[PDB]
Amino acid sequence: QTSAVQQKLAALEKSSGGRLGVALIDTADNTQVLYRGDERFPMCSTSKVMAAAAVLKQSETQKQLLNQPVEIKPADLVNYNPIAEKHVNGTMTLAELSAAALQYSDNTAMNKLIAQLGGPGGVTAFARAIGDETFRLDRTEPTLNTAIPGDPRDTTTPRAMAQTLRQLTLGHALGETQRAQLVTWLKGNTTGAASIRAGLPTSWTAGDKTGSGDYGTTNDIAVIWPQGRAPLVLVTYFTQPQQNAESRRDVLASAARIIAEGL
Ligand SMILES: O=C(Nc1cccc(-c2nnn[nH]2)c1)c1ccc2n[nH]cc2c1
């Protein structure tokens, strides 16, 4: 069946020229709304959530892990490191690296999270441990954002990512303290106001993690507290046919608006 919401998302996609993937979970009733929900998309920096969460999981058995220093060397800087570059020749703690990766989308910080987990496969292994059979991280920053059509590396599906984000932020994939820390980090994101958030009523609150890459890939994943009802989890992924395509955060906002209007 095709619902009214799915028809509207198809019309938005058609006018955009790209490929749109949406997954909503409404925790009011656990119902899902899916558009291309089982197709693969490049995650880009939305993968930073999984990496930070995996470090939070490690911290459950090491009370001091988040305070552990990690050396930042000049050679560690990559292409977008607004926080890490301040600390080159010094150190940042794993908490600081998590906050920088999540709230500022710092790619050096993400690489330190990946290294703490033993490489990209350590992030995948954590995904599997929390019941996500779909997620895969294959590369570090910056190359995980190449976003080539048909490339399975560094991809997931909207359905899998929405389920994972629910388990991490609202469910019990993490300890209570760690879940609360992840939610605090997501709610303090600096990069999200033009993406899913832009499509929601202003009275609502949310936390989110954006991503973008080549092929005009423009992504956002959010946990949302609407006025007067239970939380939502929403994933919006978007990718385009040309390598040099522009970002389209407005398409993510439009998708979010259609979802909000369909509740
Ligand atoms: O790191 C990239 N992008 C990047 C860096 C840091 C943050 C973000 C981002 N966060 N939220 N939305 N975009 C995106 C990026 C892009 C295109 C590439 N082609 N080949 C390697 C690439 C790397």
Q: What is the DSSP string of the chain?
A: ---HHHHHHHHHHHHHTSEEEEEEEETTTTEEEEESTTS-EE-GGGGHHHHHHHHHHHHTT-TTGGG-EEEE-GGG--S--TTGGGGTTEEEEHHHHHHHHHHH--HHHHHHHHHHTTSHHHHHHHHHHTT-SS------TTGGG---TT--TTEE-HHHHHHHHHHHHTSSSS-HHHHHHHHHHHHT-SS-TTTGGGGS-TT-EEEEEEEEETTTEEEEEEEEE-TTS--EEEEEEEE-SSTTPPP-HHHHHHHHHHHHHH-
Number of domains, the chain: 1
Tokens encoding 152: 């399975």
Contact 52, 98 (CB under 8 A): yes
Rounded Cα gap, residues 178 and 159, in angstroms:
23
Question: What residues are paired with 220 via a beta bridge?
Answer: 210, 236
- Best probe residue, ligand 1, of 111, 140, 145 (max atoms within 8 Å of C-beta): 145
- What backbone torsions phi and psi does residue 70 show, to the nearest 5 degrees? -130, 130
Rounded Cα gap, residues 172 and 187, in angstroms:
19
**Which atom of ligand 1 is least distant from the CA of 214?**
17
Contact 184, 146 (CB under 8 A): no
Question: How much distance in Å is there from the Cα of 218 to the middle of ligand 1?
Answer: 10
Helix 120-129 vs helix 48-59: crossing angle, to nearest 10 = 70
Range of the domain at 144: 2-263
Answer yes or no: is the C-beta of 219 below 6 A from any ligand 1 atom. Answer: no
**Amino acid symbol at 113:** L
Quickly tell me which residue has 């932020």 as its tokens: 169
The CATH number of residue 119's host domain is 3.40.710.10
Rounded Cα gap, residues 259 and 102, in angstroms:
25
- Computed from CA positions of residues 105, 234, 10, 203, in that sequence, does the dihedral angle turn out positive or negative? negative
CB-based contacts of 15, cutoff 8 Å, min separation 6: none
Integer angstrom CA distances of residue 9 from 12, 21, 172, 234: 5, 9, 31, 14
Answer yes or no: is the C-beta of 1 below 6 A from any ligand 1 atom. Answer: no
Question: What residues are paired with 205 via a beta bridge?
Answer: 225
Integer angstrom CA distances of residue 224 from 25, 130, 175, 239, 240: 10, 21, 20, 23, 26
Rounded Cα gap, residues 91 and 19, in angstroms:
41
Tokens encoding 154: 């560094």
C-alpha closest to that of 109 among 94, 124, 121, 119: 94
Integer angstrom CA distances of residue 249 from 7, 71, 74, 191: 20, 34, 32, 11
- Solved using: X-ray
Question: What value, to the nearest 5°, has the Cα angle with vertex 7 and ends 154 and 161?
Answer: 25
